[PDB]
Design a protein around this ligand. Structure first.
Ligand SMILES: NC(=O)C1=CN([C@@H]2O[C@H](COP(=O)(O)OP(=O)(O)OC[C@H]3O[C@@H](n4cnc5c(N)ncnc54)[C@H](O)[C@@H]3O)[C@@H](O)[C@H]2O)C=CC1
Ligand SMILES: NC(=O)C1=CN([C@@H]2O[C@H](COP(=O)(O)OP(=O)(O)OC[C@H]3O[C@@H](n4cnc5c(N)ncnc54)[C@H](O)[C@@H]3O)[C@@H](O)[C@H]2O)C=CC1
Ligand SMILES: O=CNC1CCCCC1
Ligand SMILES: [Co+2]
Ligand SMILES: [Co+2]
Ligand SMILES: [Zn+2]
Ligand SMILES: [Zn+2]
Lengths: 374, 374
């Protein structure tokens, strides 16, 4: 009754930066070859989406944002083989073509078909399946799940379990997987180590879960909002410190607390200063610091290279280093096997119509993850 | 005959920066508790010693420099248990106390008892064994090998094989073992990967030897001195580029050549610009870049954190990551077993009196290592 036809539905359009989302009707074109149309079930409010509003992350406007979601396939285009109509799926904001130099690498994950390095804000064929008021609406990261119906390329969606709580497992599309994978797959947190986590939101808490799951003896969470310490200690943080509660540079404090530096530090905020700070506080000869936060656009940090020369390892990662299409189904299947918990990340659950409310909440500090259930 | 006595010998004292070494007689005190007085046989001229002269590496002046050496123990002091009088040893500019948390970690090697981070230019007890002209003379990295006799702390020296050619294995004391281990231990280069090496001096060529021994498929040598290309090809470099031999950024050129970026890149120069360039030229999703060169002192680089978020791993290392007191006897035993060659590194041989002429060979570019004989 809808396959092969234009679907008229509501979406959250962003016409310009630093303005709230306009909840209006959009025209969703039917899926083309190797494309998939998804009926959204639940979507998360990631800071990454807020970065598009604030101008921190630059992508073509106007746009339908969102990338943390899980829906059910409405219709598939010609040549789609990995998902069928009626399958539960998760949009992958990092694709997995399987044919490129990174996808074939056994330990690489930033597939080259991504729309992040140089945002084109379209499908793979370079066109927009979205229309609002007759104007075409750009895509976001190949997902654009801030809509009741979206279209993704087959490389940007994975099939998850048919018996999946779609209102929880949507966090596996981004927030949880990024933080958990950064700790387990990127940093490679060892048993008994000391970990520092800068930022205690959805991704930062997920990092903490990964470190505790990896057996970290100490997990020091850092945030300038102490209202976040409670949740952090719930999921594994052994101590929480507030840089504003220190007279000297936070890194010096953590060097003391760790008796010479932490084994693994994580920047999970998106500031240049914290990125260098988080690298500074890990052990100068065998420490590892992982950047997870998104920096401001086109904008450099200044850092003493002699901080690496002593033996430090500094690395970043997209989506926790997880190969998206291989891993997102494995994580959904692990979550239901009670391998880890997603519920500690969900603080608010709202109607999609109240999407500017869940965003106002993230900018005031009151939320970790606001799920939007369609 | 001289045990427990003050010894007069020639030494190259550096009085002020950017000045020639002054061959003067100096009073070498006898060894103290856990100290070893060593007679020098051969010492190499490292670019690090020139950093002291130029001011690139700030260390207390006046100083007796030198850290590449091999010699024979004059005498030991009370409580020394690892080296007897007259054993062939190598001073370790990176000590291995074996009791801090670095020495003791499975991969760390920048022992906290080092004199690099906060150089005081003394022994472990804070005093100088060098008297020249009624003045205490600073040490250098607890080695000060630019002297017919020196006194090193027991944790800064390693007994090596008694049949060792000391005019060759002094390079295991720094130049070779640094570049070699940076490739096989630090970067941990893979079978059949593509390697880029910025800098084709003594340390840069050793990286090539490590890269080749690790099974590299392509080893791209980068140097602005085309006269360095012959020796680089001779030790395993498949190609050689002059950055001044391209119109694009050198990192664009290497990215084309590598079809998307190299697997492993090495900065073996000591320039801020080439550190970032060497990091840019490896694969954004799984490239590894190792800094080996010494940057200008307290001088700061500017790089884009988006280079790391995509996946890139950025690290540095001292002495190729080798635990010094452990590795120097093994590495001298592998040279005995013909498992690598030091002869391609030795381009010049001069007497100790010709130290100033040996430095000008390096400053002129005409040399790899000049080996001073005592
Ligand atoms: N590389 C990747 O794959 C992904 C990157 N990210 C980025 O990670 C970062 C964190 O994501 P979220 O948890 O969703 O954002 P968030 O706003 O929920 O959490 C950030 C936390 O850091 C705190 N903070 C802000 N400024 C601080 C400062 N100067 N010092 C200490 N703490 C400070 C905030 O109070 C907040 O609690 C974002 O920048 C996001 O764009 C998010 C998803 C995946
Ligand atoms: N991290 C560690 O453990 C150690 C660090 N080092 C440092 O490694 C660096 C190299 O050591 P050496 O081989 O002995 O010095 P070197 O002078 O023999 O080699 C440096 C090479 O870099 C080349 N070069 C200079 N500018 C260049 C540019 N813009 N682009 C491309 N190539 C350029 C030079 O032509 C030269 O051939 C030094 O800075 C040294 O202090 C030395 C030993 C141990
Ligand atoms: O060359 C020998 N040692 C070097 C190691 C890198 C920092 C400066 C000193
Ligand atoms: Co996100
Ligand atoms: Co050296
Ligand atoms: Zn791919
Ligand atoms: Zn030690």
């Amino acid at each position: 009754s809808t396959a092969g036809k234009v679907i008229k539905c509501k979406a959250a359009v962003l016409w310009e930066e630093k303005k709230p989302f306009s909840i209006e009707e959009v025209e969703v074109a039917p899926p083309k070859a190797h494309e998939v149309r998804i009926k959204m079930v639940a979507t998360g409010i990631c800071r990454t989406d807020d970065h598009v509003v604030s101008g921190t992350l630059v992508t073509p406007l106007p746009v339908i944002a969102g990338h943390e979601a899980a829906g059910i396939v409405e219709s598939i285009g010609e040549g789609v083989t990995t998902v069928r109509p009626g399958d539960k799926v998760i949009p992958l904001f990092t694709p997995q073509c399987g044919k490129c130099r990174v996808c074939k690498h056994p330990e690489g994950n930033f597939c080259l078909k991504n729309d992040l390095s140089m945002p084109r804000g379209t499908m793979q064929d370079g066109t927009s399946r979205f229309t609002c008021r007759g104007k075409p609406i750009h895509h976001f990261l190949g997902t654009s799940t801030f809509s009741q119906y979206t279209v993704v390329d087959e490389i940007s969606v994975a099939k998850i379990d048919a018996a999946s709580p779609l209102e929880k497992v949507c966090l596996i599309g981004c927030g949880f997987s990024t933080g958990y994978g950064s700790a387990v797959k990127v940093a490679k947190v060892t048993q008994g180590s000391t970990c520092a986590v800068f930022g205690l939101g959805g991704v930062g808490l997920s990092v903490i879960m990964g470190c505790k799951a990896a057996g970290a003896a100490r997990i020091i969470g850092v945030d300038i909002n102490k209202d976040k310490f409670a949740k952090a200690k719930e999921v594994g943080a052994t101590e929480c410190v507030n840089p504003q509660d220190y007279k000297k540079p936070i890194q010096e404090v953590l060097t003391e607390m760790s008796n010479g530096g932490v084994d693994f530090s994580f920047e999970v905020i998106g500031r240049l200063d914290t990125m260098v700070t988080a690298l500074s506080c890990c052990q100068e000869a065998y420490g590892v610091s992982v950047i997870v936060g998104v920096p401001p656009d086109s904008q450099n940090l200044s850092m003493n290279p002699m901080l690496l020369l002593s033996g430090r390892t500094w690395k970043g990662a997209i989506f926790g280093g997880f190969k998206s299409k291989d891993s997102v189904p494995k994580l959904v299947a692990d979550f239901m096997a009670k391998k880890f918990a997603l519920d500690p990340l969900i603080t608010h659950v709202l109607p999609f119509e109240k999407i500017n409310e869940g965003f106002d909440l993230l900018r005031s500090g009151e939320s970790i993850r606001t799920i939007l259930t369609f």
